[PDB]
Amino acid sequence: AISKNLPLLNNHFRKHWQERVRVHFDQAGKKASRRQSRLRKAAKIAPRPI
């Protein structure tokens, strides 16, 4: 269980971690939709600054 001259690790994976894995596949989609929300909000109230 302990072998060689290696750093001693703290890998906190003893719970059911695989049920709580959030992978951000939607990073680009959220960026684009965030931009669209930002444009719509600006155009609604123009020329008043957002």
Binding site: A1, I2, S3, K4, N5, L6, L8
Partner: protein, 148 residues
Amino acid sequence: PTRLTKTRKHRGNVSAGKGRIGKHRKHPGGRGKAGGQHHHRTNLDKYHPGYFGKVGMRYFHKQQNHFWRPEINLDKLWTLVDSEKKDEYLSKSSASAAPVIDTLAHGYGKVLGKGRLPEVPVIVKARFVSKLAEEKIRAVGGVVELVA
């Protein structure tokens, strides 16, 4: 890539490099840091001495912002002077007009005294300085101005 792994080369050989006697098993020796005082003592004593035990006093609710104090040495102190005006300052600097080096505004808490300064007066503004850093700054005709 999997095509570069030795799993591809072990195909056709019975034991996949794990041995016929040893027989790759689930967890011989325990899991994690098990047996660190019993059967992995020879490993922890050799490679991680000091692992077991307590040293020093605890500090409940330690806020690391209190201890922020980045160091800058004297051999690196003139890098905070504007690059476009460094040579002019190194030539025309005198007691009547010496460059001001604001170390806190550049992100440093203490001025330490490693290295040698140009023999040129400077005004160094610091939160903290070491004794030798200030002695070396005064020796070139400069001064340390404490700020907060």
